[PDB]
Amino acid sequence: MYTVGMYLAERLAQIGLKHHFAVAGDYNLVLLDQLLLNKDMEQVYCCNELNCGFSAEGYARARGAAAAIVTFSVGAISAMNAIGGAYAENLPVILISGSPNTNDYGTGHILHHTIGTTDYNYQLEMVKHVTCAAESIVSAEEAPAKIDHVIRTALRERKPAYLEIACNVAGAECVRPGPINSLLRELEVDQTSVTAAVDAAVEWLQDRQNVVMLVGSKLRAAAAEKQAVALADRLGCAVTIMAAAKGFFPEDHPNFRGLYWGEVSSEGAQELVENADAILCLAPVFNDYATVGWNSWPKGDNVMVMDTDRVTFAGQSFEGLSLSTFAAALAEKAPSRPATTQGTQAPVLGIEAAEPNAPLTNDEMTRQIQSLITSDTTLTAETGDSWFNASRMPIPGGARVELEMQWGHIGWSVPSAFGNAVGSPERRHIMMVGDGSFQLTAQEVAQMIRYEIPVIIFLINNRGYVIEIAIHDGPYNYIKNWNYAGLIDVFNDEDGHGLGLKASTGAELEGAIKKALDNRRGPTLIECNIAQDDCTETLIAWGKRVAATNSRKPQ
Amino acid sequence: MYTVGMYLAERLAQIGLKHHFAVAGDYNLVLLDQLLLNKDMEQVYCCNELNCGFSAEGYARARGAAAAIVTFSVGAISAMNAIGGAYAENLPVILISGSPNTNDYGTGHILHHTIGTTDYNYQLEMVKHVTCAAESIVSAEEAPAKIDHVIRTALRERKPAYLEIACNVAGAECVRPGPINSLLRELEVDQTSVTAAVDAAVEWLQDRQNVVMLVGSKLRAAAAEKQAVALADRLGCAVTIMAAAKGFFPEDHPNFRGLYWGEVSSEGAQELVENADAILCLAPVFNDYATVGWNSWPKGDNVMVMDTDRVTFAGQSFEGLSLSTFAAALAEKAPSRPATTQGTQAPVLGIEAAEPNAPLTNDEMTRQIQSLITSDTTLTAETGDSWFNASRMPIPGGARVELEMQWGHIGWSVPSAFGNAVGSPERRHIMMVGDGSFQLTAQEVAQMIRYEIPVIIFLINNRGYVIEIAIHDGPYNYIKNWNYAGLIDVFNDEDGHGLGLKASTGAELEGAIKKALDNRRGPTLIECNIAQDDCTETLIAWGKRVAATNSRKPQ
Amino acid sequence: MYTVGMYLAERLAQIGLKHHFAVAGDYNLVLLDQLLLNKDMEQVYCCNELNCGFSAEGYARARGAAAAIVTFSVGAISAMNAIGGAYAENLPVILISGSPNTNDYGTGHILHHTIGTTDYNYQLEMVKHVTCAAESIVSAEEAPAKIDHVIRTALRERKPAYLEIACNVAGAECVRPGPINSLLRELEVDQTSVTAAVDAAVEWLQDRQNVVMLVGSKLRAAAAEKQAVALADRLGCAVTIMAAAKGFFPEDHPNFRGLYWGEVSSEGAQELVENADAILCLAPVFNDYATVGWNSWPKGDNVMVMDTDRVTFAGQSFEGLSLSTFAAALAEKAPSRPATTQGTQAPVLGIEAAEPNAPLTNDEMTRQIQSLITSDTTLTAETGDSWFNASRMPIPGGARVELEMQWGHIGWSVPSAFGNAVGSPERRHIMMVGDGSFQLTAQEVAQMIRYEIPVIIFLINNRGYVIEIAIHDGPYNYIKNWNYAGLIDVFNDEDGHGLGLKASTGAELEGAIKKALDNRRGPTLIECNIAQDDCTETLIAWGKRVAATNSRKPQ
Ligand SMILES: Cc1ncc(C[n+]2csc(CCOP(=O)(O)OP(=O)(O)O)c2C)c(N)n1
Ligand SMILES: Cc1ncc(C[n+]2csc(CCOP(=O)(O)OP(=O)(O)O)c2C)c(N)n1
Ligand SMILES: Cc1ncc(C[n+]2csc(CCOP(=O)(O)OP(=O)(O)O)c2C)c(N)n1
Ligand SMILES: [Mg+2]
Ligand SMILES: [Mg+2]
Ligand SMILES: [Mg+2]
C-alpha cells in the first residue's frame, strides 16, 4: 500500500529535507503516520504552531526548504504568521494542514475547530494572501499534481506554499512518484537580453571611476553569492552590505568596506556609497527600516539595480535573465575599477576589553560574542538592539548570520535557531535574543533540550522593549522580569542537559561561555544583565528617524 | 485636543470595559497612548498576541465584550486565531490593529512587518473570514462611523470584529462621541410571527406528554438564560444540558436531569431525551464533537429547534423573533407537562473519597476540585480530559463553567482564565488545564503573577496528549516533561507572589488546595501527578466514535 | 410537496415582489420551476445576465426590492456588475444563482461553466465584495435561515445580497415559512442619543440665521423623504438638491431653490449654499463627480451631516438613531429660519420654443421632454449629457427621476427603465439615453416589446461619446452609427408593437411624441438628431474640472 501521505513524504525527501516539524491534531494523525513510514526523514514535534512554523523557517535557512504539518484552523492560523514571515524572508517553507473529511463537503455539517459555519474554505482563502501557491487535496487521484505544484513553485519562487489534505485521503492509495534530478527547475534564460544588458552595463561603466557594490538581502534567494564574488574580483571595487544582507558576502574579502545603512553605517561607508559614480545594488530590499525612514535610499542616474530576474539602469530595464546569469556574464567583461578600494579599509569592532569585574556593558558583551564567531558558526540575531550589535560585528568568511528584518516578528529567533541547528548540526549555533522577544517563544528552548541541540543563547536582560523605548516610550515597553537562567532547569526536569547561567560582568560572561562551549548535549542560556540605558548609539539615531517617519501627518 | 484613539477608548468604556489588552509595536504606540488617557480603563499587557487575543476572549466571557490591541501583521495574524475562537464561541471581541502611515498608500513603498509587496490590504482581507465586521481607518473624518459600526455589529451579532487604524491617524483630531443608553441595539421583533409561533407550539404540544428541554451552547449568546428558567418552571418538565452549555441552566433546579451527550450522557439522560415525545432544543450547536460523530443528533417530528432568531418545528419555521421573546411568550401559554420529572433525580457526582496517602487518581482529583465550586466560582476547563471531568461535576446555581468546545484550541484556558479573572475579580477562579495544553500558552501565568490574579490552576500532568491517545496513538502524543510547579519561581523572580505546588496523593492535593485559597497576591499552580492510563471511561468511548467518523472512507 | 424554491418564492412575495427576472441555465432550471408555482409573481425573462441584473435594479427603484435568477459563473459574473451597481445605488436586489450538485463537493470533479479547477467557491468569494450578505445553500435544512438572512439584511441595509442554491436542493422538501408583518425590521433606536442630538442641533440652529437644506442621494435609502418635508416645513428655510437626489424632494415646494452642484448649480444656488451659516446635508454622497473634482464639498463648522444612521456637527457625532427618527424629532423642536427664502425664487427651465422647422437642438429636445413630465411620470436619465439635461428640468411633485451617478455604467438606463416600468406600470415611463450607451444594452428593448412595456425612449444620436470628448478627446470616442429607429422593426418582427421614429426638427419631435403617447402596446424609440458640438455648457465646465482632478500628478 502506497498512500498520498507517502507521496508527499517521498517528494519532501527528494527536496533534501532530513526533518519536518509537526504539532498533532485529529485532522492530521493519519498524515503524520504516513510521514513516519518514510525512512529518510525524522518527525520533529513542537510546543505550538507559531513555533513549529518558525522552526521550519529556520530549517529552510539551513537546507533551502522546510515543511511544517499542522491541524485545521486552530493550528494553521497561528502558523500563517510564520508563513507570512517565510514569504517576507524569501524561504520555501511548505505548510501542510489536515482538513475535514471529504464526506462533510456539501452537507451543511458544523465541524470542530471551525468558526461554526458551513464554509470549510476560509483557511485556504486566508492563506493565499501569504503564499505563492495554495492547494487543497480531496482525492488521491488529484494529489500528485497538487503536491508537486506547491513544492516546485515554492522552490522556484523562493516563497512559502500551502497544502491541505483531507484527513480521510492522507492514507488513501496513490500512484508512486517517478525519479528526478532536482525539484528546482529554473526558467530558461534569454541570451539576447543578457547580452544587451551586459553590453549596456559595460558602456555605462566607461565614464564612472568610483564604483561600489551594495549587496542586498535577496542575494541568497537569487542563489548568486559566488557570482557576486566573481563580479567583485574583476571590478576590484569596494563592496558594502545592507544590514539585512550580513553573511551574504565574505567580510574576509580584501575589498570589503562595511555596512551601508545611512547615518548608522560603518565608518566611511555612508560617504563611500552616497558619493559613488556607480552603485551596483545586488538584490536589494529598500523598505522603510533599511532606508532609515526614507532618508537613505540610493536611486537615480548613478544606480544599477540588479533584482533576482531583472536589471535596471541608464533609462533601461532588462528582463528574462537571472542575477546569477547576468552577474556571471558581466564578470567576464567588466573593466577594472579599483579607485574606491584605495585609501580605505574593512571596518573593525573598535571595542577594547573592559575591566573584568566591572558591571557588564553592551560593548563588552558584544566583544565576547564576536570572538565566538568562527567560519563554521551560525549567529541568529533577534529583532531588538541585537540587530545593531550584530550589525557592527566583523565576521570571518563562511560564517552565517540570520536576520529577519522584513517581517521582524519578536520571538522568531528561538524557534528559528532551533530549526536552523536541527538542519545544520555540524555548525556552531549562537543566538542573541532580548528579554521581550524571548517571552513570546521561550518554550521552544524545551524542544532544544528534548532533541539535544547545543544552541548557545545570549539573553539580553535589559528589563524591557529597548528598541521600542528608542522609537516612543510608554508603560507598554516594561515587562515582567523572569529568572531566565532558572527556566532551563524547569525545562530539564529529570532528563535534559540544558544549562542556565548568569553574567553580570566580563569575567562571569567569559566563564559562562567556556561552560557553554563544553555543553554538547543541550542548549546553554546565558542571561546577560545589561542596563536599560546601555544600548547602541546606532539604535537611538535610527529610532528617532523611524519615529518621525511613522508619525508624519496625513494630507 | 480630542483624538481618534480617544473616540475609540470612550466607546469601549461605554460598552462596559474596564480593561483592554495590548502588545505594543511601532504601528500602535500612539494609539496605546490615546487609550491610556481614558480614566475608565486600565491597559493590560500580554506576552504574545495569541495570548492577548485569548485574554480578551476570557474577559468577554466575564463582561460580555472585550478589546485586544496589536501591531500590523506580526501581531494581528496570531491574534486572528483567537478571533476565530471568539467567532466560534460567540463572543464580541474587538481586535484593533495599528496599520501603515496614510502617506505610504498608493506609493509602492515596501514596509516593515509586511510580506514585502505593495499590498497592505491583505491583513484586512484575511481577517474578514473570521469576523462579522472589519474596517480600516485612514482619516479622522471617517473614524467615528467605522468605530461604531464595528462595535455595534459585534455586540448585536455576538461575534468578533476588526478595526485597523493608521499609525498617523490614531492621534489626529476627531469629533466627540454622543451620550448613549447602550451600544447593544436589537432588531425590532415581529409580533405577528411570535404569536403564530406560540399558537403553533401550543397545538404541537397537545398530544405530547413526555417533554424535555435540551439547553444548548448558544443560550448565553441569545441572552435567554432567565427566559429558559421561566419556560422550564411553567412546563414543569425535565431539563437537560448539552456538554458545551454547562452553567447556562442551574443544576440546582429541581427539574434538572443532567447532561445529554449521546453514549457519554449522565445516568438516565440519554433515555430521557431520545424517548421524549417533544424535545425543546434551546440554542443548540450540533457539531461533530457534540453529536459523538453524528450518532446522537436529535431531529425530526419530535424536535423543536429554538435558534437565537428563529423557531422550527412541525414542518414550519418562524423568524423575526428572538429566543428570549419566544421563550417568554411560550411560557405565558405553555401547558403543564410534568411527566418527565416524576420518579427521576438530578445526577450525583458519586465519587467516594480515596485513602489520603494512595497515589492520586483522576476521580480523587475531580472530587476535590468539585468541592471548590461555589455559587461565586468560575471554572475554566481546557480541551483534554478536563472536558470529561468538568462535564461529570455537579455545580451549584450561579456557578460559571467555561468550555471552548467549538474552536477547541489547546492552551486557550490559561490566557482565557487570566482575562476572565481580570474581568470578574469578585469571583473565585479555578482552572483545569492539561500538561500538553499548558506548554502552548504557559507564559501568560507570568501575567497572572504581574497583575496579582489569584487563579487556582490544576495542572493535570499525565505525560502527554491523552485525548489524542484515545483517538489514534503515535509518537506525536508524547511531549517533553517540565517541572511545572517550579515554573512559578522563575516567573516570580523577585517581584511575584505566585505559588507552585505538587500533589501526588489525596492528602497532598488537600494541603495544596488550602495554600491556594490563602494566596491572594498571585496564581497557584498545583501540578497533579495523574497516570497516563487513568482517564475517564467517557473519554475512551467518545474518542473511538470520533476516530471512526474522522477516518470514514471517501466516495 | 413544499420545496426550497417555494420557500424562496414565498419570501420574495412577502417582500412585495410581483415579478422576478431570469435567464435560464441547467443549474437553475428546477429552481425556476419552483418559482413559477408561486401564484403571486410573474417570471420575466431577459436577453443576458448584465441586463437581467439591471432590470432587477430598476424594479427595486419602483418597489423597494427585486430578484434576478441566473446560472453558475457564466450567468452570475456579468450580473455582479449590476449587483455592484445596486450596492453603489443602495438598492436591495437579491442575486440568486444556481450552483453545482451537492454530490460533486469534495470529489475533485471538473464542472461545466467553471474555470476548470476543483474550487466551486470562487463565485461566492467574488460576490462578497459587492454584497452586504452572501450565502450558499447545500441542504434543505439550512435553506430557511440562509434565505431569510440575505433578504432581511438586504432590506435593512438597503444593499444587494447573494444566494446560491445547489441545483439538486432547489426541488428538495423544505419546512414552510411562518407569517409575517414585514421582512424589513429596523434596529431599535437609542432615545438618549436622539434627545441629545436634537437638543444640541436645536441649540446649534438657534445661533445661525441663514439656514439651507441640501438634499442628498441616500434620502430614499434612509426612507426619510416625508420627514425631510416636515423638517423643511418647521424650518421654513431654502431647500436645494444635489444632482443625484433629483425627485427625492418636491421641487414645487414653495421654498425649493434648485440644484447645488458647484459651478454647474442652477441660478443663485451656489452662493445660497456656500454663504450659509448652516447647511443641513440630508444623506449626502460627496464623491468626485458630485463635488466637481473636489472643488465644491461643503464641510467644516457651518455644516451638519445627517447620514442614514448618524448626525455630525459642531465637533460631535450622535448615532444609535436613524435619519427618519432624527429628522422627525428635529421637525417638532427646530426654530423657524425663513431668511434664505426671502427675495429668492424657484428656478425655471428658461428655454424658449424653437422655430418648428429648424434643425433640432439640445435645448428644444430638452424643452419638449420636460413638458411630458407629470406627477406620475418616472424619468430614467442615462450617464452622458442626459445627466446635465435632466438636472436642468424642473419637475412637478410626485414625479420620479432615476439617475445612476455613483456607479455610472453606460447602458444601465435601458434595462433599468424596463424593470422600473414592469414594477410601476401605472406611471408614464420616459427614458433619456445616448447613442453610445444604448449600444451596450440595446437588446432589452426587445424585452420591452415582448412584455408590451410602453416606455418612451429618447435616443440622443450625437454620433459618439460626447461627455468623454469634453473630458479628453481621441478616436476611442467615435462609434459606428446605427439606424436606431429601424431597430424597433427588427425586434418587432411579425409580433410586437414597438414604434421607431426619427426626429430632426422641433415639429418632427412634437409629432413623434404624440405617436409615442398613443402607443400603449410597446415602447416608442424617438431617434433625435443632435449635433455633436451641441451639448450643454454645464457638461463642458464639469468635464474640464474632472479631467484636471483625474490627471493630477503623483507625489
Ligand atoms: C510579534 C511582535 N510583536 C510586537 C512587535 C513590536 N516590537 C518590536 S522590537 C520590540 C521590543 C523587543 O524587545 P527585546 O526583545 O527585549 O529587545 P531589546 O530592544 O530590549 O534589545 C517590540 C515589542 C514585533 N516586532 N513583533
Ligand atoms: C492549537 C491546537 N493544536 C493541536 C490540537 C489538537 N489536540 C487536541 S486535544 C490535544 C491534547 C491535549 O493534551 P493535554 O493538554 O495534555 O490534555 P489531556 O488530553 O492529556 O488531558 C491536542 C494536541 C488543538 N486542539 N489545538
Ligand atoms: C460600462 C461603461 N463603460 C464605459 C464608460 C465610460 N463612459 C462614460 S460616459 C461615456 C459616453 C456615453 O456616450 P453617450 O451614451 O452617447 O452619451 P453622450 O456623452 O453622447 O451624451 C463613456 C464611454 C462607463 N461609464 N461605463
Ligand atoms: Mg529587552
Ligand atoms: Mg495531558
Ligand atoms: Mg452620444
Author numbering:
A (entry chain A), B (entry chain B), C (entry chain C): 1 to 555
Task: Please quote the paper that reports this structure.
In this study, we present the crystal structure of recombinant ZpPDC at 2.15 Å resolution together with a comparison to the other known bacterial PDCs, thereby increasing the structural information available on these rare enzymes. The final model contains six tetramers in the asymmetric unit, each with a surface area of 65 000 Å2. Despite crystallization in the presence of pyruvate, no pyruvate molecules were visible anywhere in the structure, probably owing to catalytic turnover of the substrate to acetaldehyde and subsequent loss of this volatile product. The TPP molecule binds as indicated by the domain nomenclature, with the pyrophosphate group binding to the PP domain of one monomer and the pyrimidine ring binding to the PYR domain of a second monomer in the dimer. The pyrophosphate group of TPP is anchored to the protein by a Mg2+ ion. It forms an octahedral coordination sphere with the two O atoms on the diphosphate group of the TPP, the side-chain O atoms of Asp435 and Asn462, the main-chain O atom of Gly464 and a water molecule.
Pyruvate decarboxylase (PDC; EC 4.1.1.1) catalyses the non-oxidative decarboxylation of pyruvate to acetaldehyde with the release of carbon dioxide, and is a key enzyme in homofermentative metabolism, where ethanol is the main fermentation product. ZpPDC forms a tetramer from four identical subunits in a dimer-of-dimers fashion. Each monomer contains a pyrimidine-binding (PYR) domain, a regulatory (R) domain and a pyrophosphate-binding (PP) domain. The TPP molecules bind across both subunits in each dimer, with the pyrophosphate group binding to the PP domain from one subunit and the pyrimidine ring binding to the PYR domain from the second subunit, thus forming two active sites in the dimer.
